Amino acid sequence: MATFKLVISNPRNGIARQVEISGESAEKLVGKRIGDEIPASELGLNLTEIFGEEIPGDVKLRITGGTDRDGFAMRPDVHGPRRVKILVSRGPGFRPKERGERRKKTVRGNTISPEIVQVNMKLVF
Amino acid sequence: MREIGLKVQPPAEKCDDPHCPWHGHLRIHGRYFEGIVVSDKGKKTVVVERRHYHYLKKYERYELRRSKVHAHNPECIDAKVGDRVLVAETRPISKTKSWVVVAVTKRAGER
Amino acid sequence: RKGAKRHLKRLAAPDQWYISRKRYKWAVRPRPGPHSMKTSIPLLYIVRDYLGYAKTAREARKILNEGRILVDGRVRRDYKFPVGIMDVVSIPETGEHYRVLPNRIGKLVLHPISEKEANIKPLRISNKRMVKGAKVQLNLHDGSNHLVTVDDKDNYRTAYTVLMKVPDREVIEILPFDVGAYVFVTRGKNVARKGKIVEVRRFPMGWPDVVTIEDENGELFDTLKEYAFVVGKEKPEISLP
Amino acid sequence: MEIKVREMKENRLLGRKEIYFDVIHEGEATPSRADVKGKLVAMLDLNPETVVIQYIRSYFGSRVSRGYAKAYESKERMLYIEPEYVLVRDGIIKKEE
RNA sequence: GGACGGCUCAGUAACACGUCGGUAACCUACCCUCGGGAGGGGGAUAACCCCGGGAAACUGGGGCUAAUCCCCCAUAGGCCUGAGGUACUGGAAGGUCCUCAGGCCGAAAGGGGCUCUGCCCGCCCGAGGAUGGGCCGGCGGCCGAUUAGGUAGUUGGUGGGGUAACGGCCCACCAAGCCGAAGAUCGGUACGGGCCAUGAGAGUGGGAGCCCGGAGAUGGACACUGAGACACGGGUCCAGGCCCUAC
Ligand SMILES: [Mg+2]
Numbered sequence: 001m002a003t004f005k006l007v008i009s010n011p012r013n014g015i016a017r018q019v020e021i022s023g024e025s026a027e028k029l030v031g032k033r034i035g036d037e038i039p040a041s042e043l044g045l046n047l048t049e050i051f052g053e054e055i056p057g058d059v060k061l062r063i064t065g066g067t068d069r070d071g072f073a074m075r076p077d078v079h080g081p082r083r084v085k086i087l088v089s090r091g092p093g094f095r096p097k098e099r100g101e102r103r104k105k106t107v108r109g110n111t112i113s114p115e116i117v118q119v120n121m122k123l124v125f
Numbered sequence: 126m127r128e129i130g131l132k133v134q135p136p137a138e139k140c141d142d143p144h145c146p147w148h149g150h151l152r153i154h155g156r157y158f159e160g161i162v163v164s165d166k167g168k169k170t171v172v173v174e175r176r177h178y179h180y181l182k183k184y185e186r187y188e189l190r191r192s193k194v195h196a197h198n199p200e201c202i203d204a205k206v207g208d209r210v211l212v213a214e215t216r217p218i219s220k221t222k223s224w225v226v227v228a229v230t231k232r233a234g235e236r
Numbered sequence: 237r238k239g240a241k242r243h244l245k246r247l248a249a250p251d252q253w254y255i256s257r258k259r260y261k262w263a264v265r266p267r268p269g270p271h272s273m274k275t276s277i278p279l280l281y282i283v284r285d286y287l288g289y290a291k292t293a294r295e296a297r298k299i300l301n302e303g304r305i306l307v308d309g310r311v312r313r314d315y316k317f318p319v320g321i322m323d324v325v326s327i328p329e330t331g332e333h334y335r336v337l338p339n340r341i342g343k344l345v346l347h348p349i350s351e352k353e354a355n356i357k358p359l360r361i362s363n364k365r366m367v368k369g370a371k372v373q374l375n376l377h378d379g380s381n382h383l384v385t386v387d388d389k390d391n392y393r394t395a396y397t398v399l400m401k402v403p404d405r406e407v408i409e410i411l412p413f414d415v416g417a418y419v420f421v422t423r424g425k426n427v428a429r430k431g432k433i434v435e436v437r438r439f440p441m442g443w444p445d446v447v448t449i450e451d452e453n454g455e456l457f458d459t460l461k462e463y464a465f466v467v468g469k470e471k472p473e474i475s476l477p
Numbered sequence: 478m479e480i481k482v483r484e485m486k487e488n489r490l491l492g493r494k495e496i497y498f499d500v501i502h503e504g505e506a507t508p509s510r511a512d513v514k515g516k517l518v519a520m521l522d523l524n525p526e527t528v529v530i531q532y533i534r535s536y537f538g539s540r541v542s543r544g545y546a547k548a549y550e551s552k553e554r555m556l557y558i559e560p561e562y563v564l565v566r567d568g569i570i571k572k573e574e
Numbered sequence: 575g576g577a578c579g580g581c582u583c584a585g586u587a588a589c590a591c592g593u594c595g596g597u598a599a600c601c602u603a604c605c606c607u608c609g610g611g612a613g614g615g616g617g618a619u620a621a622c623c624c625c626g627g628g629a630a631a632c633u634g635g636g637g638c639u640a641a642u643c644c645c646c647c648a649u650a651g652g653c654c655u656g657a658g659g660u661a662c663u664g665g666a667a668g669g670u671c672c673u674c675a676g677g678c679c680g681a682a683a684g685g686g687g688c689u690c691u692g693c694c695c696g697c698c699c700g701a702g703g704a705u706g707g708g709c710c711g712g713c714g715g716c717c718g719a720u721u722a723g724g725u726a727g728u729u730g731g732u733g734g735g736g737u738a739a740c741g742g743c744c745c746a747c748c749a750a751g752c753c754g755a756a757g758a759u760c761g762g763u764a765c766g767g768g769c770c771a772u773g774a775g776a777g778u779g780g781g782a783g784c785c786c787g788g789a790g791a792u793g794g795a796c797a798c799u800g801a802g803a804c805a806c807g808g809g810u811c812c813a814g815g816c817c818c819u820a821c
């Protein structure tokens with residue numbers, strides 16, 4: 001399959017909702033990178049959606065990241081759909097405790113693939 | 126003319142490298158001794174030999190012990206093989222050189 | 237190995253502390269401070285062991301943090317603070333003053349004194365820089381520093397002594413290093429010995445200068461100029477032993 | 478029991494009289510801190526609320542024990558300076574749970 | 575703050591150790607003294623809230639906020655060079671200081687608490703000291719000649735680079751030096767010492783336990799951060815081995 005759990009985030013409210021897509025909408029998301037806007041109109045999810053009120057105009061989604069089935073987060077700095085194991089020193093995919101820790105962490109690349117599960121989406125007005 | 130800390134006659138001519146105590150910026154500190162030159166091949170580099178006697182507690186006797194030092198030789202003091210030079214300790218000038226010749230008593234003849 | 241020392245073992249301690257070296261494992265490592273490790277002892281040992289106002293370091297630290305012990309007119313709350321030669325340790329609540337001075341054995345002792353002398357501290361000058369502003373910084377043996385001017389820069393010389401009023405730091409009574417000057421030795425073999433200077437020898441290179449000193453009983457002994465501390469012109473005037 | 482004081486020195490820094498004393502207990506066991514404290518306040522009209530006994534040590538072949546006690550000017554100084562185990566021993570404090 | 579302490583003695587025949595000395599060839603947070611300063615702006619982000627992902631280890635997105643967090647500007651200050659004056663110390667000035675030039679780098683938390691108009695704990699710069707180290711040198715301490723020639727950046731020099739700092743430490747170019755039969759080189763063994771055992775002593779032997787120093791943290795190699803580590807309870811890779819796993 002190509003199903004995806006999208007966490008949509010409204011910054012106007014500071015609020016978020018999880019919605020699972022499972023078909024050709026998901027397959028349309030496939031191939032997109034962090035930084036790529038998409039409209040909920042074609043994506044399928046309604047506009048009086050789970051936020052209930054404060055309905056948008058036809059506000060457009062934008063990808064911000066997400067994790068895969070094995071738990072590794074996409075890093076926009078990395079190009080491709082595949083995983084790498086890199087020294088990072090502060091990035092998404094690493095929460096450093098000491099001042100100069102620099103651990104090597106496995107991450108996923110920016111562009112979406114079937115192996116993704118969590119997909120973070122800010123709605124952009 | 127400067128008066129480096131140990132009273133002995135300076136050279137006559139005054140033109141040298143900065144690694145000369147009197148005419149350059151080299152400093153001397155620590156220990157100083159007289160010794161005999163046994164090599165003068167290297168440019169601005171001689172080998173000075175001491176000869177002290179070492180006591181053996183067991184055999185109640187003495188043995189000679191030679192010690193070379195590898196000093197710097199400024200052209201104002203062009204000490205040659207045989208001369209009783211005065212040598213003094215300074216900073217490292219090379220891998221082996223940490224000493225500098227300052228004065229001479231020449232020796233055309235030896236035994 | 238990888239860095240500095242934060243500890244001290246009581247056997248590896250200075251030889252001039254009166255410490256009871258085998259009773260425990262550890263000793264107070266002195267902080268960096270006025271004097272050196274060779275001419276100091278920590279205030280904890282002074283409060284607990286010498287004077288006996290505490291059997292325990294917790295009591296001593298409580299005292300020091302209450303502020304009952306001055307060192308040259310200043311409250312010292314740190315138990316690792318170095319207290320050195322010719323230092324004045326005052327306890328006002330008890331009306332006591334002590335001069336830290338060395339013994340003939342070479343160890344540091346507290347000589348009792350009164351308030352008048354307790355407002356005095358003699359300082360061997362020990363160096364003299366020219367600092368910005370074209371001012372003269374006297375660099376004194378307690379690691380202290382005094383600024384003077386290019387007018388009396390010549391009245392101030394290196395091995396001289398300066399009497400100092402310490403809670404204010406006002407120079408009184410410069411005492412020069414000359415012949416006839418009364419002197420108190422601080423280190424060496426002839427440690428807590430005193431007398432008048434007789435001679436000085438120079439010794440070309442970095443070999444330290446040496447002074448010949450005449451005691452009260454007419455004897456005549458040498459030591460180092462750096463270990464010769466001037467206390468007076470003809471009389472010690474600081475109540476030494 | 479017989480108390481015989483050796484030394485009684487003041488400490489204004491901490492605020493306490495420090496008493497060193499002998500307890501002669503010929504023929505009896507070395508006495509209890511309670512009894513020693515009572516006899517001590519009597520011998521010296523001290524405030525038992527502030528008197529604290531540090532040690533009573535009996536030696537080999539002596540039946541003359543040696544003791545160190547402390548007499549604070551204030552119970553608050555006593556509770557601040559003196560440690561909890563000493564206070565518990567003299568019974569000033571019931572261990573707090 | 576964690577670079578101490580604590581453990582071990584593999585390696586190492588070496589300036590590793592001991593001792594005398596040197597650093598005018600260097601670094602030093604905490605601490606002391608003195609002398610000065612704290613001006614003007616700005617920003618983000620944890621915690622928290624919404625939603626989570628992943629077997630775990632771990633980790634994402636959005637919203638919100640502060641600081642003794644972070645950034646900027648200027649003033650001080652720091653470094654280099656050039657010129658000259660000769661006030662300082664030193665045994666001796668490539669040092670300090672004074673004046674002038676050209677430049678580059680470039681601070682700070684007037685923060686917090688009280689009995690608040692004063693006090694306490696604090697921030698930055700400079701000068702020195704102290705503390706702790708780095709580096710240099712003289713002397714000193716095993717075996718083997720069925721190990722005799724060794725060395726090729728090797729010895730030195732000129733000029734540089736680099737370093738906290740001197741240095742063939744490294745580089746370019748010049749030369750042919752350096753070590754050695756008083757035993758080099760190679761091999762063997764070994765942490766060094768204070769000390770210990772023994773013995774009339776001379777001496778022979780040992781150098782786990784306590785202190786001092788050194789080195790190492792499965793083997794090997796490399797870095798980040800920090801005053802300080804190439805870091806036993808931090809990081810990365812290889813080798814080797816083991817553990818959990820939803821492989
Ligand atoms: Mg700026």
Ligand SMILES: [Mg+2]
Binds near residue numbers: 764
């Ligand atoms: Mg071994």
Ligand SMILES: [Mg+2]
């Ligand atoms: Mg193991």
